[PDB]
Write a protein that holds these residues in place. Sequence first.
Motif, PDB file in Angstrom:
ATOM      1  N   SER A 120       0.840  -1.185   0.000  1.00  0.00           N
ATOM      2  CA  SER A 120       0.000   0.000   0.000  1.00  0.00           C
ATOM      3  C   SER A 120       0.881   1.243   0.000  1.00  0.00           C
ATOM      4  O   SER A 120       1.831   1.319   0.767  1.00  0.00           O
ATOM      5  CB  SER A 120      -0.890  -0.015   1.238  1.00  0.00           C
ATOM      6  N   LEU A 122       0.167   3.982   1.230  1.00  0.00           N
ATOM      7  CA  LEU A 122       0.024   4.505   2.581  1.00  0.00           C
ATOM      8  C   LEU A 122       1.156   4.103   3.541  1.00  0.00           C
ATOM      9  O   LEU A 122       1.541   4.861   4.439  1.00  0.00           O
ATOM     10  CB  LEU A 122      -1.344   4.093   3.154  1.00  0.00           C
ATOM     11  N   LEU A 149      -5.995   9.832  -3.159  1.00  0.00           N
ATOM     12  CA  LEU A 149      -6.140   9.345  -1.793  1.00  0.00           C
ATOM     13  C   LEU A 149      -7.407   9.914  -1.134  1.00  0.00           C
ATOM     14  O   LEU A 149      -8.160   9.191  -0.503  1.00  0.00           O
ATOM     15  CB  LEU A 149      -4.872   9.680  -0.983  1.00  0.00           C
ATOM     16  N   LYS A 153      -9.953   7.104  -0.159  1.00  0.00           N
ATOM     17  CA  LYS A 153      -9.794   6.780   1.272  1.00  0.00           C
ATOM     18  C   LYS A 153     -10.330   7.826   2.251  1.00  0.00           C
ATOM     19  O   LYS A 153     -10.415   7.558   3.452  1.00  0.00           O
ATOM     20  CB  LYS A 153      -8.316   6.568   1.580  1.00  0.00           C
ATOM     21  N   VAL A 157      -7.366  10.106   5.888  1.00  0.00           N
ATOM     22  CA  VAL A 157      -6.309   9.181   5.461  1.00  0.00           C
ATOM     23  C   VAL A 157      -5.287   9.948   4.649  1.00  0.00           C
ATOM     24  O   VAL A 157      -4.084   9.787   4.855  1.00  0.00           O
ATOM     25  CB  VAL A 157      -6.876   7.970   4.679  1.00  0.00           C
ATOM     26  N   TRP A 161      -1.297  10.629   5.659  1.00  0.00           N
ATOM     27  CA  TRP A 161      -0.211  10.252   4.756  1.00  0.00           C
ATOM     28  C   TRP A 161       0.748  11.405   4.571  1.00  0.00           C
ATOM     29  O   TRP A 161       1.954  11.225   4.629  1.00  0.00           O
ATOM     30  CB  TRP A 161      -0.759   9.858   3.408  1.00  0.00           C
ATOM     31  N   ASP A 220      -4.423  -0.294  -5.814  1.00  0.00           N
ATOM     32  CA  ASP A 220      -3.981   0.570  -4.720  1.00  0.00           C
ATOM     33  C   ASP A 220      -3.940   2.018  -5.206  1.00  0.00           C
ATOM     34  O   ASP A 220      -3.691   2.256  -6.389  1.00  0.00           O
ATOM     35  CB  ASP A 220      -2.595   0.140  -4.256  1.00  0.00           C
TER      36      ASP A 220
END
Length: 308
Positions: A120, A122, A149, A153, A157, A161, A220
């Motif tokens: 990932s 992340l 992102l 997400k 999130v 990050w 991803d």
Amino acid sequence: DITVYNGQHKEAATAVAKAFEQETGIKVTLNSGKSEQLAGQLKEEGDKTPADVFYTEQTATFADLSEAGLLAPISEQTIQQTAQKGVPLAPKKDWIALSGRSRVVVYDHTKLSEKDMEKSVLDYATPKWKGKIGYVSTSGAFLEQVVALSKMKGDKVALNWLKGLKENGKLYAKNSVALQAVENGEVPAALINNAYWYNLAKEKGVENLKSRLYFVRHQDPGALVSYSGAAVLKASKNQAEAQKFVDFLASKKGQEALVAARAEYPLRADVVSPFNLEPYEKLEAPVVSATTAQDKEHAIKLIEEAGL
Ligand SMILES: [Fe+3]
């Protein structure tokens, strides 16, 4: 003869124009600039624009033009040439995706292997990577990654990050600089785009490089692909040649001309890149809506909130 407003890299536009002029005898004139500025100009020019075709590095720029009623329909047979699974399609059949650029992780294979990589994107912003992951916060594709992102997400999130990159990453001014930092042992990995490495590899020989690429795949957020494409202006009173040029860009020969000049992924499945790119379908890119100017303003705000 036709006029093409060009937001793509000049080497790409020059190559496809030359191959078109050779195949058909129709001359192409390029007016080059930033896609956002050119789209703005097409809007202001309206019925009076001299542009026959808009050729952009980012299909996201087409949305506003399509909404403003400024784009002509393209043949459905042409659209189908590049309509691989995952490739964005114009709801009104009034632009076409032609090629792709991918996010990647560049790594020093003398220090790390695929065992050290993450499943990932992340997870690169975490303590394991403290002082060991390069990133380029001013880069356009970096901004697109943040947008993706947030969409995939959520903002919490995405913000986490960025804060994780602030804490754990090494900042580089440009992608080329980050690539060199990996090659020279300054940092063992960096978040980047595919083209830099593939260009350096073709020119220098992969056997003469310490760095390699890791692709996260499985949809991803780090498997993000950004798409280039083309559209015909509705205002054009040379629809026949404008359409001929867009048809050509989607043809085997048009795609071959592009990939010989630039390390982008062809979206025809019967075209192979001399930069030794993997087939587009193997990237397993996620499906993400087009970046709007609003998406960009929001992402910049998150970068600022993270101290970057
Ligand atoms: Fe770049």
